Amino acid sequence: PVERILEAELAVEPKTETYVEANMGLNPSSPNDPVTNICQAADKQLFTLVEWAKRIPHFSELPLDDQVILLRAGWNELLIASFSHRSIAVKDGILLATGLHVHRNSAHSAGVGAIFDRVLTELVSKMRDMQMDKTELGCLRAIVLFNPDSKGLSNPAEVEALREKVYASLEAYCKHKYPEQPGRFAKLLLRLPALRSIGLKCLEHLFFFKLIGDTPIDTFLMEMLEAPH
């Protein structure tokens, strides 16, 4: 339950060295080729997401096609929830997995300032105000993952049952850990609608593409444009 979901969060997402461009990236790879480079980044990021989902109790016991369904259904929300929580530490933009700080101005220059500000006000500041811990973020994500509304599921009910085991545990965790905050559980769950709407706006705006591709592309462009004809 709770302890295995918090271990899932901690397992794939940290290492004081990774937040300094892992696999050497900071000192390796060195941005040069456009689309392939960014496609590799996305691949790396999604995979981390999968390794995490696989550590969620019972996720792997589900039919393979359902696991795929759930992943296509919640990947964007799962991602935004992770970097939003990670960002409570700063009051500017957002911190990425590599510990890199994406400042507010970068996103307004990229043309996604409005959606970026929603992330900041509706998720980051809200998470900061209630000091949402990793156990709690982990549970919300597991809840998002087990989305029984996903289309094509061979057995929505089983997914619904997995969802309830997680939230029944989130509530027990909260009441036991923060008894002085009787409405905390509801509060955590009530950040889900915001995540839902911001999630959709990020897709229509190609938010993730710009986040990992805009720089690599500008660099390649300015490089090729000034290069010898």
Task: Report the binding-site residues for 9-cis-retinoate.
Answer: 86, 97
Applying CB under 8 A, the span of 12-20, 82-90, 98-106, 219-227 interacting with its own copies comes to: 219-227
SS3 148: coil
Q: Which residues are annotated as a binding site?
A: 86, 97
Candidate list 116, 173, 185, 207; residue touching its own copies; CB under 8 A: 185
Contact 106, 93 (CB under 8 A): yes
Contact 78, 72 (CB under 8 A): no
The footprint of its own copies on this chain (CB under 8 A) covers a number of residues equal to 61
Applying CB under 8 A, the span of 2-10, 17-25, 91-99, 145-153 interacting with its own copies comes to: 145-153
* Residue 95, H or E segment: strand 94-95
Picking from 95, 115, 112, 92, the residue whose alpha carbon sits closest to that of residue 104 is 92
Binding mask 26-55 for its own copies (x = CB under 8 A): -------xxxx-xxx-xx--xx--xx-xx-
Token output for 20: 């300094």
Residue 132's CB: how many other CB atoms inside 10 A? 21
Minimum CB distance to its own copies smaller for 20 or for 164: 164
How far apart are CB 222 and its own copies at their closest, in Å? 6
221 counts as binding its own copies under rule CB under 8 A: yes
How far apart are CB 133 and its own copies at their closest, in Å? 19
Q: Measure the CA dihedral 81/87/88/93, to 10°.
A: -120
